[PDB]
């Protein structure tokens, strides 16, 4: 009944704040293990506060499914990457049973599904392409992405590696992938700055995050190609241990939330934009 839950910061889904001397308003407590130094394994769990779309979903599932939790932020990797058949990130936490479930901006994909069970998708996502308004690209299939050296100067585009986007590009567009690695971005914030300061032409990334970013862009310069078009559509899901007894009740509660209009209330509250 008292479940260990892993999360990862990614606005507007998961937002991390410092404690007030407890957690205020719509915030739930979340711990992060912080190392003393880089020449030790010793560290301490810092008490922080978590809010966002996925945190409201957790609050609802907690109440409906009737469980209590100890929420922590992953420190070994991010979302999930299989390195030499060993998973890190939120996926790794569930795979190696340090977490009963993973809640966050976690993309359902085939290779992750082989090692964890996912809930029904509760946020539509996939791959979107962000550009400065007026950039002439048709989408991922554009010859500017497919054969970038056919252009003088070549189109400069990248993603934030180690997540589901790079995995999809590596699998579907081998040339595009090997070309992209020189334009790898440390994160979303770096990527948007590069775009806004002419160092990058296009940012390939998670559709739901990119559409939120476009909707909140100052001056509405940055847009996603198409009417916020999605390539390799998938969704965010709660990851659970293979054959978990929690999956069933969690799927039922999510489909209940959709039926009752509770989903649209969260989408309106967290994801609507100006642009």
């Amino acid at each position: 009944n008292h479940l260990s839950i892993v999360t990862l910061e990614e606005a507007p889904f998961v937002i991390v704040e410092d404690i007030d001397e407890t957690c205020v308003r719509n915030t739930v407590p979340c711990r992060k293990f912080v190392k003393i130094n880089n020449s030790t394994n010793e560290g301490m769990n810092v008490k922080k506060c978590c809010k966002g779309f996925c945190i409201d979903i957790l609050k609802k599932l907690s109440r409906t499914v009737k469980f209590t939790y100890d929420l922590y932020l992953v420190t070994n990797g991010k979302h999930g990457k299989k390195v030499n058949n060993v998973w890190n990130g939120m996926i790794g936490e569930v795979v190696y049973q340090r977490a009963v479930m993973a809640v966050g901006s976690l993309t359902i994909n085939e290779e992750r599904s082989e090692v964890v069970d996912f809930s029904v998708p509760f946020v539509e996502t996939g791959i979107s392409v962000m550009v400065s308004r007026g950039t002439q690209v048709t989408g991922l299939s554009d010859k500017k992405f497919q054969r970038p050296h056919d252009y003088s100067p070549p189109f400069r585009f990248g993603t934030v590696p180690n997540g589901s986007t790079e995995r999809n590009i590596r699998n579907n567009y081998p040339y595009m992938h090997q070309y992209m690695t020189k334009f790898n971005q440390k994160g979303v914030e770096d990527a948007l700055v590069s775009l806004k300061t002419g160092k990058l032409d296009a940012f390939i990334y998670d559709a739901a995050v990119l559409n939120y970013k476009a909707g909140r862009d100052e001056g509405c310069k940055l847009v996603t190609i198409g009417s916020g078009y999605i390539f390799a559509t998938t969704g965010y899901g709660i990851a659970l241990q293979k054959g978990s007894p929690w999956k069933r009740q969690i799927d039922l509660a999510l489909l209940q939330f959709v039926g009752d209009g509770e989903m649209e209330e969260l989408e309106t509250l967290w994801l609507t934009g100006i642009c």
Partner: protein, 279 residues
């Protein structure tokens, strides 16, 4: 002796086209690339409380292309039939019973549901749904000239015998309007005018009988793009997915979902959307 899968489907354009066979019991060879077609046994006679004479028919569309891909992927044999009662499926009180493809699957008359079948709480309490192969919503089909702001329009929130708006009987849209108290007023109008099928309802909007049809956008949007005398109004409410239905015990449940995820990732699902879906 047979480890062949009984597949149940329903007539729903553009996912499942149902046409008669040729004089020799084969399908008219059509082209998009060849149009893949299956023999689907089903009742020739519609109308409620009437004898159902099972006849071989031809089945094609988004869902058939999907079934063929699923069979080839998991190495299964199958046989296809259309739902005897012509319905998607609701749980009604008789003791409660599932009707349509839901009833069919729960009784073992079918081993799998392959159709634009909405994933909802009510059905997920009894059956296994695969990961969705399509995410869509509900919209309203009106005649070119009729004006409605959406689900919040006073012509629907405040019903009258003047403006007739309905949906399909024993469908998920029926389940949604029934479960929600905030829409009870609208459900009370609809119950009196609901059609036995979406085709019948679509034609009734063409023949001025029905003035608004609340249905799945994947089907309404496709219909509006063909029949320019009909248009869709408002945005999308009850954003839901279409999934493959199996019994909770099924040994194909994990592999069905992995195949659907594969097809989303490799563009196959986007291909079906281009081939069959997208005035």
């Amino acid at each position: 002796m047979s480890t062949r899968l009984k597949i149940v489907t329903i007539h729903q354009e553009p996912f499942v086209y149902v046409k008669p066979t040729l004089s020799d019991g084969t399908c008219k060879e059509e082209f998009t690339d060849p149009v893949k077609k299956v023999i689907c046994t089903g009742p020739n006679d519609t109308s409620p409380g009437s004898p159902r004479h099972t006849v071989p028919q031809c089945c094609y569309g988004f869902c058939i292309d999907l079934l063929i891909k699923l069979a080839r992927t998991m190495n299964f044999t199958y046989e296809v039939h259309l739902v005897a009662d012509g319905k998607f499926g609701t749980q009604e009180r008789v003791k409660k019973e599932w009707n349509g493809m839901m009833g069919e699957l729960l009784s073992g008359q079918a081993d799998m549901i392959v159709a634009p079948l909405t994933i909802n709480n009510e059905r997920a309490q009894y059956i296994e749904f695969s990961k969705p192969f399509k995410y869509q919503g509900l919209t309203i089909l009106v005649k070119k000239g009729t004006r409605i702001t959406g689900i919040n329009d006073p012509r629907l929130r405040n019903p009258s015998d003047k403006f007739i708006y309905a949906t399909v009987k024993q469908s998920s849209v029926d389940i949604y309007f029934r479960r929600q108290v905030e829409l009870s007023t609208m459900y009370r109008h609809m119950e009196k005018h609901n059609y036995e099928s979406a085709a019948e309802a679509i034609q009734a909007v063409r023949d001025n009988k029905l003035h608004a049809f609340i249905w799945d956008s994947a089907v309404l949007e496709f219909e509006a793009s063909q029949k320019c005398d009909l248009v869709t109004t408002g945005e999308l409410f009850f954003r839901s997915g279409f999934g493959i239905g199996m019994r909770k015990d099924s040994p194909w449940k994990q592999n069905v979902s992995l195949s659907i995820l594969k097809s989303h990732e490799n563009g196959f699902m986007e291909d079906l959307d281009k081939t069959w879906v997208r005035c």
